Each structure stands twice: as structure tokens, then as C-alpha cells.
Nucleic acid binder design. Sequence first.
DNA 1: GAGCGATACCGTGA
DNA 2: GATCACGGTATCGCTC
Length: 341
Amino acid sequence: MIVLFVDFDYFYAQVEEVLNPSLKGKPVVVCVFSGRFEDSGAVATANYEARKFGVKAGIPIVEAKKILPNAVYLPMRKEVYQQVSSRIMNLLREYSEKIEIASIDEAYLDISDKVRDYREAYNLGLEIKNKILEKEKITVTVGISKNKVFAKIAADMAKPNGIKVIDDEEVKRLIRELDIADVPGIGNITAEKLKKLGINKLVDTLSIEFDKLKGMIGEAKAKYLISLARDEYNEPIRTRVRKSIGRIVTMKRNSRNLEEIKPYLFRAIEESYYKLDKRIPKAIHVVAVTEDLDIVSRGRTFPHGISKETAYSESVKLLQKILEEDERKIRRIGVAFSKFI
DNA sequence: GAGCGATACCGTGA
DNA sequence: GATCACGGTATCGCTC
Ligand SMILES: Nc1ncnc2c1ncn2[C@H]1C[C@H](O)[C@@H](COP(=O)(O)OP(=O)(O)OP(=O)(O)O)O1
Ligand SMILES: [Ca+2]
Ligand SMILES: [Ca+2]
């Protein structure tokens, strides 16, 4: 088909800009402060101005305070970013009935029925870029290509504020010339098992025994990467359905004292039942991050919806079950509700 | 041998 | 010093 990918530029930071235009140009850094000491947390994202000296998503707010003592450091209002995403999403529904809202920030259109080629597609790309900018003053990148994977990759080259097609000739080029670490879904641990195998391009994955791939990365990515290289990949745009919802919070001190921890855990459950709104989970899992940073979870499915009072009682039993089965101290604790009715 | 639920793992910031 | 949120998958024991 023809997929159009849209991805909002430096999204949290851009929305901050738009809600107070004085920040434009100045370096802006949206943070997740965790409240264990001064500026304890992580950098959610940062406009490109600030991104120039080292301050990217995921690194600590202290290491970020080093590189730019003088930047503007805002707290993250995810609820705000959501509300304005929702709208941009709604604007994109007037350009195709077939839409995959992939995240708060990304969405794919199956526009094969709305145009006939890549130049007509592309000129849509501008129609849409121009619409979002007029209606909401956000700028976005657009990736156009024959499937969802290569349309994400078109965009991840052209950003920031860009647009790029990948005609079938260019696709042929990249299965050969593109590095496998720049494939959607190939992160660090796997790019390594692939260097450790001589595969450094997609096309390289065809001329190897398939169980050799299967053995290393699993039948899933094996079959994923192969189809991509045989150009036989083709996955349809489909609306996603939230399958889980939860909240993990951080504790001012570590601990394995059940009564010190309970307050944090009941808080994760209120923030969770508010996010749930009208949805009735049948499954609950308690989730401890250890002080080692490994992640542990205990769970229980019921044959019926979970009242909050239930969530409270089961949550505390699932926690005790975690304290017996593991001795480490716990740093962060939260819950996660799934299997909605 | 495979189906199914619990849990851990990886990814991606989809 | 390491947030938070979440989907999709592999692995492990029970089970038929
Ligand atoms: N480690 C992270 N932790 C928390 N939030 C993140 C993280 N990474 C990305 N995000 C959030 C904030 C982003 O504005 C938003 C979109 O992710 P992504 O599109 O890759 O980042 P971005 O919009 O800031 O940069 P880009 O311009 O490359 O798209 O998701
Ligand atoms: Ca993105
Ligand atoms: Ca983005």
C-alpha cells in the first residue's frame, strides 16, 4: 500500500513552547522529577536547541543540569500533552479512514485509496503538515513509503520538520545499504547478536540458515527481519487498543518494610483507577523495581472485575509474595491493570 | 508435543 | 544517577 507516517517534533517541549511562546530558541527541557532529592529524575525530552550540547531523553536531570545550568527546566504535564495530541490525531482522521495511532506522538495513515502514486502522496504530506501548523502551531515530520516500517524510517531520516518518500527503488537500496541497527525493533541487545553473526544489513539475513537467526534473536524477529529483506513485509494499518494501564512510583528511600511501602502502592492504585476511568480490569499485577534496577512482578487474574477495594487487598498480598521470593531492597513500586472487560 | 497462564525480557520511546 | 509507560515476545511449569 502507501503509508504516510506522521511524527510530532520534540513533542513535549514543543507543546510547552506553544503554551508560552517566550521559550522559542532558548533551550527547553521537560523533566520527570522523582522527588528523592534535588532534581532527582530524568529528562523526558528537550527541544533541539538544548539537544545540541548533550541533553537527550533518558539521561539524569543532574547530568543535564551540568551541561546547561541556565536552561529552562519544566515539569512534565503528560495530561496536557495528551489533550493536544488527541486533537492533532483528530485532524489526521480527515485524511484517511484507516489510521494507526501508534503513540502520543506518532500515527500511520493508509492513504493508498486517497491518491495514486508517491508525488500525490507527498503533496498530501504538505497539506497535513500545513494543517497541523495552522490549527495548532506544532510542526511534524512525515515518512512516506510502501509499508509501516519503511514509512517510519523515511521520517526518522527527514526529521526535524521534514518529509521524505522511499520509492521502491530506494527501498531496494536500503535493504542492502541500511545498517540493521536503524531498523525499527532492532535495539542494542539484538544489533549485537547480529554483529556477532556477520549480519550488518537486512539483505545479509537471507543468506544464512534460518534456524541460525531463530536461535539467536527468536523466531519472531527472524521472521520479521527476513520478510523485510525479501520485501515481503506488509502489515496493515490497524487501530490499537490499550491492553494495560498502570502507575509505578518512586520511594523517598528504599525499603523492604511492608508498611513503609504500602502508602506508595495505594497511591499507584488511585492514580491507576483514575486512568482506568470506565474500564474494568480482571487482572492486576504488582511491580517492584529492585534497588539493583531489575524488575519483578507478581500477578493475579480474577474471573471478575476488580473493585478498588479488591485492588488494595490483592495488591498487598502480591507485594508480600514479592518480598518472600526476592531479598533485594525495592526502589520503585507500582501496579498495572490488564484484561479489561 | 502443544495450549495456556505467569513471569521475565526487549524495545521503543513503536 | 537511572522517570515512567507500555506492547509484544520468549521461557517455565501445569495440563491435556
Ligand atoms: N526515555 C523517555 N522517557 C520519557 N518520555 C520519553 C522518552 N523518550 C521519548 N519520550 C516521550 C517525550 C517525547 O516528546 C515523546 C516522543 O518520543 P520521540 O518521538 O522519539 O521524542 P521527541 O518527539 O522529543 O524527539 P523527535 O523530534 O526525535 O521525535 O515521548
Ligand atoms: Ca517517535
Ligand atoms: Ca517525535
